[PDB]
Every structure is written in C-alpha cells, then in structure tokens.
Point group: C2
Chain length 222, copies 2
C-alpha cells in the first residue's frame, strides 16, 4: 500500500466515519499531512484524486470542502461504497443489478432497432467464451456495454463504464455457478433471435425475466 | 487559467486530436512538462486528475497509457466532450435528454410506489421557484435527481449526479424560454397528481410526452 493509497483510504474512511464530516471544511494541509504521515506533495495529489471523485471540492484560494458524496459523486464511487459499508453491500448489489436490468430494456431495444448489425456482432462474442467465472464476468459486462453503445446513444455506454468496477466484481462471484453461466448463454442467444426477428416489443419482457431469474440465482448464492 | 488548468486542457486536446493517440503510451513526464511548460509537480497533479477521469491509466512502475475515453470514462466527461466536439453537441444533447427521459420513467414510477411521501416533497419545491432560467434549470435538475433518490435505489441518483454538468448547462439555455418554464411546471404538477392517485402505470406515458414536447421546444431553440 503506497503512501498515496494509504492517505486516500484514510481520508475517505475519515469522511465516512465523520472525523471530517460532509458539509464541513477539511483540516489544513499541514495538519493533514502530519496526521496521516505523508509529504505535502503526496497529500496534494491525493486531494486532487478525491476531488475529482466527488469526496471534496477544491477552489483556488478557498478552504477545501468535505462533500456529501451523494450529491457530488458519480458511479465511480460504487466499489468504494461497497468497501465502506460491508453490511449494506447486499442491498447495493441488488440496486445495481436492478439498474442494469431496467436501463438495458431501453438500450437493447434501441440497439435492435437502430444498429442490429452491431448488436448481433456484440452478442456473437458469446460463442467463444471459456467456461469459467472470470471469462463470463468479462463477457457479460462487454455484452451489456456493447449493446449500450450499439443503441447509438453513447451516454448509455458511459453509464455502463461507471458500473464496471462493482458490476464485474459481482460477476466474478456470480459466474462461479455453472447455472449462472448457462442461463446467461441462453439469454444472449435469445436476444440474438429477437434481434433477427425484429421482435422489438419482446425485449422488455425477455430482459426483465433474465433479471429476475439471474437475480434469484444470485440471492441464493448470497 | 491556472498552470494546472492549462496543462489538463492541453493534454486532453492532444489526446482528442491524436497528438497522444488513445491506445498508446504517454510521453515521459520530463518531456511533457517541458513541452507544456509546467513544473513536474503540476504535471503529476494533472495526470492524477486525468487518470481519475479515465483519459489515462497510471501504474506504479509502468509507463502511463493514453486511454480511449469511451471505454474508461464515465458521465464525468460529458461537458469536456461537448467542448471538444462543438459540431456534434446537438446530437450529444439529444442523447442526454433521451437518457433523462427514458431512465426517469423507471425511477419516477418506482419512487411513486416506494416512497411517495419523498416524491411529493421533491415535487412540491416547484411551488416556490423564481420565474427565470437559472432558477428553473436548478429546480428541474433537483426534481429529477430528487425523484431518482426517492426511488430508494441511490444508483439512479449517482447517474443524475454525473449528468448534472451538461444537463444544467442545457437547462440554463432551455429555461430562458417562458414556454419551457410553463410546460415544466405543468409536468411537475401532473406528476404529483399521478403520485397522489397511485397512477403508477400512467407515469411512462406522461414522462415520454414531456420528453417529446420539451424536446420539440429545445430543437426549435437549437
């Protein structure tokens, strides 16, 4: 664990446990570097990283503000969030999968209507996949992301990019179960057929059923 | 424009114009600081910021990689994206509003079912609003974000947080039109009535119609 890593983790934990409460000004840099035990330049790089992720707000000639991350942070904090509240992780994971399922009903339908060639290309990558957890987790994430971009609206893609960290961490655990891998292959294959048939109005129900059934398998593993 | 601001903007522009192509290694720090004209510590803080936003990948003892931001960046780059490709902005804006509309059909319905008290509280803030662009832009963003969190699934909220920058910039221009302000007040009021009535299945069509009609007003302003 680098001096920077140690400092970033210390400050985030200190915000979470209210040593540095959201809504207040962060202690002076000299005070902080002395408390954490890192150089002022290490601290500055760390504060820059945290600011960019939303934990803090830095202003040219004003004190640094500790933010409530729920107002200023994006999908980027998801893994950190999982790590800080180990007890709420199950809920957080259910929320993420629910977002994946519901927002995908939108972009998968749009991709089938706007760029079916691209959607087919993305879905066809399922034919190669190695039969194991890490390979499926990658595959699954790439298909949802690939379909998001295939909608022709890249903003859905930026959303999947932010979900990646926690999403693939769930996948690596989820796809250790053989049934999870099988239900997913069945899903990608059915998606391709719906795309081929132009069965746009059937995408919603097919994706919702996959969300629910893969959700049942996961809840049982949790 | 600070030395750091200048450097960050230079590197991002250089990636966009392929002086530093995505998929390649970034020039050595001494070389970069000399070219840009900033100190090594300014450069390091800047590289840390860019890495956190996805433009680059930094590894303890390996060269820095220039990323294709479409794979590694999140909703955070939206404004930067608008600034880099002035010609595609119209499309980008249409895509963002479309995402707002379609994903909100999901979280607004969920908020009305799970936390109608909170949804009502959020919607009631429309009663105070000052009759002008900046106030409505803020209001409108706060209502969509407020409803996203009111769904009980905070991940929808993190998504709105990432949309904020570009979303409110569009709003500040959009709500300069009196009709835009009026159609929105009508929308918040109708949303409250649907919430009150438990008319969950009517949320989809009401939000889609608002998306389309506010979209028509905007396209006409563009």
């Amino acid at each position: 664990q680098s001096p920077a890593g140690f400092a970033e983790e210390y400050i985030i934990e200190s915000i979470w446990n209210n040593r540095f409460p959201p809504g207040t000004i962060l202690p002076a840099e000299r005070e902080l570097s002395e408390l954490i035990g890192v150089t002022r330049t290490t601290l500055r790089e760390v504060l820059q990283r945290l600011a960019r992720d939303g934990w803090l707000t830095i202003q040219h000639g004003k004190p640094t503000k500790v933010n409530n991350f729920w107002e200023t942070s994006g999908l980027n904090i998801l893994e950190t969030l999982a790590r800080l509240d180990h007890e709420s992780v199950p809920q957080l994971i259910d929320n993420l999968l629910s977002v994946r399922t519901n927002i995908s009903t939108i972009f998968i339908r749009t991709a089938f209507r706007q760029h079916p060639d691209k959607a087919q290309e993305v879905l066809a990558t399922a034919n190669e996949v190695a039969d194991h957890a890490d390979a499926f987790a990658e595959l699954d994430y790439n298909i949802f992301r690939g379909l998001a971009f295939a909608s022709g609206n890249p903003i859905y893609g930026l959303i999947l990019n932010g979900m990646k960290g926690l999403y693939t961490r769930i996948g690596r655990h989820y796809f250790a179960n053989p049934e999870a891998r099988s239900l997913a292959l069945g899903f990608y294959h059915k998606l391709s057929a719906l795309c081929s048939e132009g069965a746009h109005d059937q995408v919603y129900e097919t994706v919702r059923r996959y969300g629910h059934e893969s959700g049942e398998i996961w809840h049982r593993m949790q």
